[PDB]
């Protein structure tokens, strides 16, 4: 469970039995034909896979390139999170667990988890941070409609990190009945491998679709990176393929302003939620609060596989600011009629940061941005626009 | 363009010119395979077609049936309306039009139209009636469409369509009018149905690979009738029990509903001879429904013909019953259905389906209806 020096199982000792039980159960389904049949049948009929590779003609003409969008926004619940939530709650039910817990910031992973819990008829308790938006109010009503319990997180600054903290305390105090569902590729082994292996269907589908459109592998593949599950899903089948893989972290107000979530670019090696990885820290090793106009990227850590990919040069990493992501949000809505998630808008914004004239670019559209409409229109950068 | 005695072009004389040029342009693409190739490529890559046919295991176990759901909620914009909007604006591009106009009530059809207009890079002007509406207005503005609030009449979907047709009449040189359903003057009912029949043609090729036989029932909600006619047309005279469900509102015998085929009378609405809710003096009556998508006093002429010749059966369910189906599918399957499609799901309690294979048309997702369902007095009590 080590990606070079990163990863590991840096957890309280009482969690070692659950991690070893999870690792053994996951190793059993690796060859189980029945599991992958029930899972892939749900990905097709319940989630909507395979998602199409859409040629954005008007976006391509603006940049003088051939830009393709991997349409993960067309999935059920409207984000890639549904791919990981279905497979993990299914694994939980197969392991005999009767309760599901998870943490969420705005409510996206909470909705995807509560959706899979209602599909499999399991108890679901979601710990959610505080934000005064119609988006979160809708997610609360979604999760309550799906039958899940929502516990407003009051610890810390009531962020996604604080919600994950409360969900982990729930897991430890309910280890007999509860399965913990992480939202990204951040966590103790084998969680980063489990989440990535559930998301790599994105990159596998992409590898089969792009030669039908261009007769060759793409020149670039761009995806937004916070924890890194959607980027790892599309990057993994293309590792060491020669395709330029670019992960875009949240630059916030600026990489030198102290208000961002670029764990790889500005973080230090540390421990967060079970994994040794790059975390935003001060000089004394204390985790720092992240910031981003995108709630999905507002996380101070990054998956250990991305820290390994960055070190070995297999994936290139950069960041874009809040304003650049807001501009890409409006740009795709006007040019293609697709309202992208503010998370994926960071990857779309990077189309301006690379010389793509005449290049074939695939952008991972990780979700739709209807949840972000009020945040975008009320932002002072857009209001002044 | 007559479905027996229904249909026609009952319009003012000024509209006859654009309707003849629109019919003429539509006959040209009837055999043009380059048109339908571009249309189907967009349906696949842009809208997300083909949509899956999902076996609802927990829902099937509740009634003893094998209930399947045609997942139109997984389309772009989250409703079947996108199938029609993409095809009409594609037709607008071939005709040389550069402006798109349409009418909408809560804004569901306005978003689908503004989405297709942005995809083709065209000007879009939407006429709309009075959080779901606020969000839809923000969508249409983010998509680049001009939203004109409707002030005439009761400011409903019917009044918005009137202003949109008024807009089309004034600018019939550069503007293509996009209807939302299979209601309107010829050739619009056939154009919309021919764009929506991809649903039934997909369902016809999917249910064999899942049951070996043809389905026993195919249920779908009906207002104007675009999503129902889309899934019904490839199954007409096939033996399958085709059932359309209209909006019963507060009750069929309450005067607060939208069941045009059940409680309406023959008449004219927006250019089509069909069944319209009206009083004993021929004046059109206002419709009511907990779902804004079904809040329309008319029905498509092809549905009036199907009901008369017995090729499709029609019924209606109450607001309270649609709210139960809304909560039921969310709790049982984790799929929040549209309050429109919830009328079809509620019909699973009104027929014997024990051992029968049923296909319900999930016309759209119901995240737009979350605030309306929870703040309703019937749901607030429970
Ligand atoms: K981060
Ligand atoms: K009606």
UniProtKB/Swiss-Prot annotation, chain A:
Give the catalysed reaction(s), semicolon-separated: (1S,2R)-1-C-(indol-3-yl)glycerol 3-phosphate + L-serine = D-glyceraldehyde 3-phosphate + L-tryptophan + H2O
Q: What is its EC number?
A: 4.2.1.20
Biological process, per Gene Ontology: L-tryptophan biosynthetic process
Molecular function (Gene Ontology), one example: tryptophan synthase activity
Q: Which Pfam families match?
A: PALP
Name the cofactor(s): pyridoxal 5'-phosphate
The metabolic or biological pathway listed in the UniProt record of this protein is:
Amino-acid biosynthesis; L-tryptophan biosynthesis; L-tryptophan from chorismate: step 5/5
Q: What is this protein called?
A: Tryptophan synthase beta chain 1
**What organism is recorded for this protein?**
Thermotoga maritima (strain ATCC 43589 / DSM 3109 / JCM 10099 / NBRC 100826 / MSB8)
Gene this protein is translated from: trpB1
